[PDB]
């Protein structure tokens, strides 16, 4: 079985004009033959373009690519991961039908979800899924889908997907996961139950903090051709360009994957024994609740996860005093990242949903980058031990 | 008193490291100076950045140039047009609402209209808005909006928008205009008393044929913060790239129009006056019903436009034996395209639907370029000779 | 007309693609041993590397050579890139050029500096005088050079009457046209041998791409041109090509723009009580007027003018709203700069001088901005 | 010390309108405040740009980087190596100068100093540049540089840098040296004794295949400007889009060139002991000779190299049955290239010198990439083993 390594490096489909790398193809239309050719084209006969909102060849590479990490019958690309997110629920979601969510899950996706969904006559709970009977307990006759983050952003709340997927596929729900915090190389959704899996590609897969994009990929062909046609009408394209630098930047993902994943570990055993440190949220700890769950169901961890300190004066002073970590939301950058959640990434979730997601001011979220840890743990151990 | 062409060369705003042009932010995320300096932003206090999905420099640039050309409060890049029109209306309308939308519309609005709003319990009617009392009739106790194009894609069917906009702004709801096929150098939707006016981008504003992107711009502070807000979820971005390429195609967009409108109006005058030619509907003609409102409403007129021809056989013989224009979907480019709407643009729309817009296989929309409006009128003098 | 060519250039589209696709390379594949052998032989079509040959470049080559009328263009990462490559790909150790006394500063610091440590003899005489040409021959002659109208001055030159000498007596006549574009001067059309532009300027007009263009009248000239460039290496991106490309697509429409605004500004201001003198080659006024009206068939946009001292020129400058103080020109907004402090500071005293360029001469590049708000603008600034 | 992997994550400089990736400058020109402020510019006082030519903001944010990684006083970003080439030795060169130059070297490097630089009066002579002592015979009273590829395109040849650089510094040369072929990770000429180090970047240090591009280090303010005063004559510019990309290709790096380093030792193992093959030429093998002046005066190998096949035959069967390596010129990309330097990279090369090269029909280049070792070990020896 040929490495992921050597498959992205080598993907399927023809090069064009015998070019090396894939050309962008920067343009909106297509040329056609003939009237008979365009369409045919329109009905899906033959093979061939049309319009990039309906395809673009660079934008199909970097899906292909995607597709075959994911074990897809197909991907589809966004502007945004939440151009993905959208396209994935309210690609099927219709008036009448219901939705239960995590009660973790990043906070535009709260927002869509709390906001948005109910205004199209969507029913939604958001319950805590790392426990399987209370997944169980929430279902209704018109349950038509659950939406897992496992490990959640930030707390790296673990569900159990496989437990889960089962119930779905026992009654007729697709389960959707994003799978964003770990990146396709150790978090394979189709391969537990799912029936979708998607990610923001702004954050490990493109890895260089230079794009935003969204990606879903689908285990049927009928799923991937809904979001797509979804797509087509809601309108959220990733940009020729920014394809481009997708495919790039996931020329080095295993790689960057590798690293992420030892430094991150690293790091989060350094805190651990920091007397500053009261506790570190990193589901590849053996002191973390789910890491049985995550080490079964996943074949490494992402580098972002979170840390308590003793208090917000003391959160403050840290991310403060850092000279390689950058003060910044987003994650999965090559350099390493630092945000206090309770005032940014979740200032703006709902008081109710902030107590049970356990975000406090005393957190600090760290998404470790592929830097040398020994410089990375110095910088962290320099300003945790400042007068 | 300073001309369009000007405004558009000199943007307001400061400009970066003293680059005279507008540099590219491709950039995913922004740093903060301090906690309490991202704290801040979150809240909406102070200047600056977090985040390329809540807000980009090089987008915002191409975004105060449109709200600029439109006398909008603010503007919001997407995407694709059909971006900036699933968040200038699925931001407003919810379930139990009613919308009435023009009964000629492009492919996807109709799509969207017919298939996806009524999954949201969004009514939907589709009306012919060429006739005020007819939108009146339509009327229920829960109408929240009306949905506009003017001049209809492909048909060019006018609409009286500012008789419209009076019914909206005495019943209570929001008048939305799709201006694409006119540009906003031209059809201004704002000042005949709409709420939103957006395009495509794709088309005549970039009008290179290199990018595809969408722009909504609203009368108001609010409406313009609660787009931004449905986009912020919805995820339907424009590119940095592709807002560089925008800002760029726009900086020529007033001469390209002149350009457009003057060789447009030459070439269906050619046309109208041909043997093989049953009719011509631009919304310059004398001859075009609705000419009358289009000639007091707008300032000139794009140059995107069908024709009829005598059958399926004659259309298909015109399309391809043409040597400059190009068989190709799309819009508002700089060379000339040429398309077929029964089974291109138009092929998806329900038969109901499409017997209503009056599009048959006779049919045939150009969209004219800016090339010498001669080698136009004599690739087509050429193809319709055979 | 023009806009008609480079809107529908010859070639195949890619993929069906409308817009050319940006070739965002640098190798390319081959089928087998012997179809990579063959294509470094030049035999059959196809792309092996981008410094030798990228499709993208040489699709905005191709739209360049149509226009100059032509053998082929190559394209270059600046105008100084083709300037360089015009030259030194001919003139060796032992050859004698001869330069117009009034260019753009990189290329009298080019002539100046680096041909003579090459062995390269070189004069900078007056070519707006043609008998001066003759005088300055000598019988290793191998290269006349020019730019007309001048930058910055605008000095014109008789580029069919100096073609003529160089043919007859053996050298080969290269014009930098710069100032003017493809669409207005068109020197392998006036018997000159090769024709360049930095496409920084006009022909991409838009101020965002630096780039070079080279266009010669023999398929053996050009070849020669790409040849050096594959060895020297200024190279224009596959983005600035497609960029370039892009700009030039409006060419046409901007220069009669560009023409007609800057004929009205230049003469406001050579009516203004304030202004001395304007250098503009479309004016009654300007010596030399009568061969540029009769070797080109328009003008660009960018010209000098004489203020009263410097003072006033930099009280001018620096009050301006719409106008940017900035070097560089033929961009689709107006710029204006300051010669002797700035693009020509670098000039030999000895040079300056005979160019004639002074503390008080300001030049200005028209942008296609309404007219009337450029000379709102300027009238402000000289009355206020 | 920090990291050279930190380094190049976290260049010096301020961020630009707080973006976290450094924006993409694509102007030519840049404003004035005042006459004055542009005036003092222009004679290099005070802070700022004026046009791209002279510097643009993107491409100096990728010089300072190689810059930090050389260790030099200054770099120069260029549209291609063979602009840093040509502007790192006609800077300097004029006539009546003597250049001795190595006898292997890149083709078009050949191409340079044998046909332009006798037309512009400068004396050059080829020598074996791995002998010192044929270094001293060939000097003259008027020799004013000596210019190295080690190891050279495409043999692998080593010269001796070290010992060249004393006699350079002893008389008054300056030493150039072309480390393409190894990246600034693994041979810092300026630490051995070399005024200037240069790179093709459309190999190694880009590592996408998608750039060409050069840059030019040198030890002194004074070179370095003099390299840039040329430039600026000579117009060999790297655009700002190409500059965002080699800064971007250039964050991975370290990393790559690690696993690069790794993977081409071990297919040079497996082909040096397979019956087809005659030899092979890596510089880390220890049969190789020049292998211990290698290893003392770098601290890693590139991973592109040459093997003998038994014939021409041969060397075609192999080239064209590979499913993960590809035939195409170039080399340092991410994926594995192969190609034939008798009939591609040094074909232009005149006889005398490929003969002195020793360069013949049975001869294959190999570039390892960063796919999974074994999956390139197993594509050449199933193409290897054909019927
Ligand atoms: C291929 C597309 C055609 N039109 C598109 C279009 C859109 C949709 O805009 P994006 O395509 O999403 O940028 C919105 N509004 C109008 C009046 C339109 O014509 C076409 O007809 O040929
Ligand atoms: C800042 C630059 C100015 N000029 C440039 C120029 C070049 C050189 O072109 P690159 O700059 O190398 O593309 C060549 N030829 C002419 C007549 C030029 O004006 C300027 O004057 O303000
Ligand atoms: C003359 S082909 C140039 C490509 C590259 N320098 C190589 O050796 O493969």
Same mark, same amino acid.
């Given at each position: 079985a040929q490495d992921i390594t050597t498959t992205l490096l080598h993907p399927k489909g023809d090069h064009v004009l015998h070019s090396h790398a894939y050309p962008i193809f920067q343009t909106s239309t297509f040329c056609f033959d003939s009237t008979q050719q365009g369409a045919d084209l329109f009905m899906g006969k033959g093979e061939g373009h049309i319009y990039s909102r309906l395809g673009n060849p660079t934008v199909e590479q970097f899906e292909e690519m995607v597709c075959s990490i994911e074990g897809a019958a197909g991907s589809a690309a966004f502007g945004s991961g939440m151009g993905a997110i959208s396209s994935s629920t309210l690609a099927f979601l219709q008036k009448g039908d219901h939705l239960i969510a995590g009660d973790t899950l990043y906070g535009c996706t709260v927002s869509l979800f709390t906001h948005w969904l109910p205004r199209f006559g969507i029913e939604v709970d958001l319950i805590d899924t790392s426990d399987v009977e209370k997944v169980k307990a929430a279902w209704k006759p018109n349950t038509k889908m659950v939406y897992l983050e496992s490990?959640?952003?930030? #707390?790296?709340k673990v569900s159990d997907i496989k437990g889960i997927a089962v119930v779905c596929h026992e009654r007729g729900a697709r389960l959707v996961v994003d799978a964003t915090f770990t990146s396709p190389c150790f978090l394979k959704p189709l391969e537990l139950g799912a029936d979708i899996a998607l990610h /923001?590609? /702004? @954050?490990? %897969?493109? =890895?260089? =903090?230079d794009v935003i994009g969204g990606v879903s990929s689908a285990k049927t062909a009928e799923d991937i051709a809904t979001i797509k046609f979804y797509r087509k009408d809601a309108g959220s394209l990733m940009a020729p360009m920014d394809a481009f630098l997708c495919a790039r930047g996931m020329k080095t993902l295993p790689i960057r994957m590798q690293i992420h994943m030892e430094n991150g570990l690293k790091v989060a055993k350094f805190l651990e024994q920091?007397?500053? %440190?009261?506790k570190v949220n990193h589901? =590849?700890?053996? /002191?973390?609740?789910g890491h049985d769950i995550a080490k079964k169901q996943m074949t490494g961890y992402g580098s972002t996860f979170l840390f308590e300190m003793k208090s917000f004066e003391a959160a403050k002073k840290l991310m403060e005093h850092? @000279?390689?970590? #950058?003060?910044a939301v987003s994650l999965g950058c090559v350099d390493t990242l630092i945000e206090h959640?309770?005032?940014? #990434?979740?200032?703006?979730?709902?008081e109710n949903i902030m107590r049970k997601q356990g975000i406090t001011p005393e957190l600090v979220r760290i998404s470790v980058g592929i830097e040398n840890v020994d410089d990375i743990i110095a910088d962290l151990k320099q300003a945790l031990e400042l007068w």
């Open positions: 490990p959640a952003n930030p #707390t790296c /923001s590609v /702004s @954050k490990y %897969i493109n =890895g260089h =903090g920091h007397e500053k %440190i009261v589901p =590849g700890l053996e /002191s973390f609740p850092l @000279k390689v970590c #950058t003060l959640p309770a005032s940014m #990434t979740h200032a703006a979730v709902p």
